Design a protein around this ligand. Structure first.
Ligand SMILES: O=P(O)(O)Oc1ccc2cc(OP(=O)(O)O)ccc2c1
Ligand SMILES: O=P(O)(O)Oc1ccc2cc(OP(=O)(O)O)ccc2c1
Ligand SMILES: O=P(O)(O)Oc1ccc2cc(OP(=O)(O)O)ccc2c1
Ligand SMILES: O=P(O)(O)Oc1ccc2cc(OP(=O)(O)O)ccc2c1
Lengths: 345, 348, 346, 346
């Protein structure tokens, strides 16, 4: 009673490797209806199904310069079943440009009673049947987001254990259905903590994640990790260089992520488009041994400038697509250490 | 940042105590559509909504002799929103007879990959909103069933840990919504294992359950436990007395269940009606100290003869209700150690 | 492959029940040489082997009024091999008065690196052989003390897990050698935390303790628990009644201690002689259901006045023994709820 | 509350890297008195301190061809304080040849009650003081051996958790004293299980080991791992190539051992001299990515021919040393993948 056959393992490993192939990263376009509404609101655009469709089309149909930059695209359920103006389903559009289609499958955070505002994430019910259908409809990987926060009593032992366990359940169900799970334990940058505190918490969270994945018999070669970079908190007064951020990030990963993991696809969080590229580039130039692909799974850091240039106006299509292409090319170079605009750990 | 206020704790504790008050147990009538279908096929009756309504009505409207016997009734979702012939919602029927209304909220078992046929249970998604709605609609306690199996390499560490964890998540969400959770970690009797193997596994499962409930800040006084009795496997060749089953059961509970737990409501599993009554009565006569109510949460051990006597025929209503009443009375006496058919310590 | 046979289980259960039989508790006299030195220093007495022997003799040979009060006596290694003036080994003196002999077997606390001053406890190496010898030499139960502290980031997950685990190892070894283990996870009263914080930490620690005992296959009927009472911190500004202390303590125990545990023998900690008796009495009068004996395992709360009355002078023997008898009698009444000098909010 | 300062970290990391520098491995000569007795008995030699000293001297004073092969030497306590014929302490002999001195610090296995013959390991009591003394006396790394067995119900959850936890306690204490800990969770080859069963158990054990090291705040860059290679059981009838053994071994390590671990020093266990060299060579030629040194920490695989050529006779000194030197050279090439005498299926 092994969880997976050699054939199933090969399929998962091959998918995971395609997504993070050299020079490639992930466009994270899986904002739910409530979250994308706030993005559209920031440009005074109504949150209609058509406006959401057109915006996703804008990103997915950028010119072929993005093909070598984008190994995967994460979609929200609605977008997976939408079509471009030429009638092609968006999964077909993505594949025709050399991309793997991903689907976000979690159903949001819920409060953990007895904690200081901590959450876990729901979405396991009927997940297997959903994954089998998503697989039939063109998806080959999935995403599940857990959220943790650095504070006085947080993240607590309960929150670390519970989020690690539910990530492992999600990963197990995905792999039974031919879907590569992206494991996203995000530690929010909120607060005034410093770099080494983020590093400490990240190390503890990731140790818990991989012990849980082991307990649940997860095939690591058929997974990806989507962590926060190790950074000071948003309100931290002490300032750090990108090389220090890179060193703390790579050290934390080296202390917790088994080499069998196929790749690490960083979330951009609250970083600017340039900051996310500079940090990712510094991570890839960090002189330590890094036995996994180190690339991007960016939302805002790929979309910010495209969203503004668009402004909800059809005539700004080309201008908006150019901004996205410029960030896709930048981060493709960053994940190779080719982008130009220690014992203390 | 405590999970619950003193007012919320009092509500949950008062509910839990009402359900298992002396002489009272639970009617477990929460079979899902697929499971009740098998019950109806066994008496050649069609599985229609009306036949399900009629059958549930048959149990819930039995004469007032059941009132001091039934502290609680577990319903399936459909039944919570059905009505008796007089137009009364079934929850109002139950309450008017002194019972607390329960709702089963799990969404069935699912396979754990990498195990020898082991499962966990799903049903957490949107559970808080469901509990708030069920509370509004008259439910005060809930049920969630996890299933474990004694076998070669089972129950495994993973299966024990995961089922305990999901039970604790369910219990936490229930208590946030004023619903008393019934925690049901059922160890099936399938297999040829002997009595002391069942006792060992039951002790290990219950220790994991209560550590998980602690980790998730569960208020034990506002919970009930629905375990298997400790019995040999169905295929075991060695035979045991009811006194030995009782001693093994009470010993396992005394080694694992904190006295703050308000009550233990046993499942009947594959036991016959009489066997389940005799065993419960022996459990209550066991001379060891037992700091929780020890009563019943019975499905087939309350229903089997009523279902048969009914046979799907409206003219058999009174005869079917009489069979149910008889088992309700029997088990009311058994959960007091007062049941009669007339109506070594360190070896464990 | 059960850990114990029915015969080994009966032996352990019988011992545990003798120690905590109704009206009985434990004299904890197992201060090591460095700790008893501070006690003798407090009365201007030199810390010699003979002064330690004499002081322990004073306690162990008090008159027969203590016999129904004292179910057990915990000794330090040295004392287990000392003799009274009549030539009798101290274990024989204890047994002759109806007491079970206990031996402290831990080797003190050690720091946990990476923690905010937290410790675990050492003493497992060669413990099985030590237990076998102690059993031959008249001991039937043992004691092992872990120490946890309430503070900003303490007790940490690491400290709770590690102390629970080492207690389980100790208990397992003891039970293989016919010794009933007393499991002592002391949460110190140091600090300004309030009563509900102590209750919260005590509930979490004891849940960890009993999960570890389960994982290690410990026979609970052949164990005793020696916990702190649930009290405010020593420096807490909010004040509480003995009844609140009792309610918080009994509630924490009811939420964590399986009924199979044979007895709970409270440590006195920093409490005065009278405070420790009043609190134990209030615990036994608490109206909730308590399915285990609730009695005492007291050091200073049985010894403080005896030590002062002695003052190191052999001519104060009887006066000092009288002070210990008075506290033994007080606490025997208290563990029955017979001593006189909403639960949903917990 | 960080466990170590940057300076303490630098020292441990520097030591760890010196031991497993390219081409180098470890001579494991830390057999205790009882275990070396079995070795000497197999060559008809009396187990006296002098014969133990002479045999250890024979190994430690082998000619300078072993200097680039031997990065560290593990000694038993007795040997750390013995001297060569010329009066030089053995630690000075080792260092004068470019070797780091190691000390075995565990006190052997003890049974876990309630298990099917499983053990944990003892040795924590007073370990901090022992480590500080050993550091003073020339040791810079240590070894602690836990033993697990593949059987019907083994290794159990209890055995895995407890051995991982005690290994982490040992590692923590070592690092507080400037000693690099070698963590040895040996899964025995006993039994008739196949290669994938060993791989499965090895992955589960190592995942538990590294979670425990994380919980105890262990600095992984200042540690080494001494695991079993992944092999079929001794009584398994199915046959495997060295390339399959290598693939299963590297796959297991890639799934569990964080890249920050400085090196993996395989135990030889029951393997012959040639088999252990050939397997280590195939491990280093395995085409998968390996972010740690993969070298040897060998006892009998370095000593077997030398012990037999010696036969307890002083006049066989040079013939015996020659056999040891030949195996040090062989394994130095093997840990470089230069010794000569589908992946989804794992
Ligand atoms: O809860 P929902 O809004 O439905 O899901 C989310 C939540 C956060 C996200 C963040 C993203 O950017 P990045 O931080 O991954 O780079 C991209 C997509 C995201 C989708
Ligand atoms: O999965 P479902 O069938 O929908 O839910 C179930 C499963 C098992 C049951 C067993 C019962 O009898 P007892 O074993 O509690 O006495 C009573 C109700 C039950 C309901
Ligand atoms: O560390 P050592 O000194 O060797 O052992 C101790 C430590 C604390 C003690 C406290 C006591 O009083 P109580 O708290 O048990 O009532 C009695 C004996 C004690 C012995
Ligand atoms: O129990 P003790 O005898 O005191 O210690 C041991 C036990 C096993 C050993 C195995 C060795 O060979 P290898 O398996 O490390 O290659 C070398 C030294 C060993 C020492």
């Amino acid at each position: 009673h092994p969880a997976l056959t050699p054939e199933q393992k090969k399929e998962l490993s091959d998918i995971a490797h395609r997504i993070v192939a050299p020079g490639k990263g992930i466009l994270a376009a899986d904002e739910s209806t409530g979250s994308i509404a706030k993005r559209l609101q920031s440009i005074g655009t109504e949150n209609t199904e058509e406006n959401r469709r057109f915006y996703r089309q804008l990103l997915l149909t950028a010119d072929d310069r993005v093909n070598p930059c984008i190994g995967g695209v994460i979609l929200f359920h609605e977008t997976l079943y939408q079509k471009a103006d030429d009638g092609r389903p968006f999964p077909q559009v993505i594949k025709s440009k050399g991309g793997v289609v991903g689907i976000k499958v979690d159903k949001g955070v819920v409060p953990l009673a007895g904690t200081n505002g901590e959450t876990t994430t729901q979405g396991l019910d009927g997940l297997s049947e959903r994954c089998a259908q998503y697989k039939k409809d063109g998806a080959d990987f999935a995403k599940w987001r857990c959220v943790l926060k650095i504070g006085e009593h947080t993240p607590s032992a309960l929150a670390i254990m519970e989020n690690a366990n539910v990530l492992a359940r999600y990963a197990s169900i995905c792999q039974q259905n031919g879907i590569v799970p992206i494991v996203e334990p995000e530690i929010l940058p909120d607060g005034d903590h410093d770099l080494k505190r983020c590093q400490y918490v990240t190390e503890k969270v990731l140790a818990a994640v991989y012990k849980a994945l082991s307990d649940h018999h997860i095939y690591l070669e058929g997974t990806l990790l989507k962590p926060n970079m190790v950074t000071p908190g948003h309100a931290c007064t002490q300032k750090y260089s990108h090389e220090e951020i890179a060193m703390a990030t790579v050290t934390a990963l080296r202390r917790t992520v088994p080499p069998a993991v196929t790749g690490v696809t960083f979330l951009s969080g609250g970083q600017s488009e340039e900051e996310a590229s500079i940090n990712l580039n510094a991570i890839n130039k960090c002189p330590l041994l890094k036995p996994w692909a180190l690339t991007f799974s960016y939302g805002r850091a790929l979309q910010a400038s495209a969203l503004k240039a668009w402004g909800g106006k059809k005539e700004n299509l080309k201008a908006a697509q150019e901004e996205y292409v410029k960030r896709a090319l930048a981060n493709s170079l960053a994940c190779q250490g080719k982008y130009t605009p220690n014992h203390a750990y």
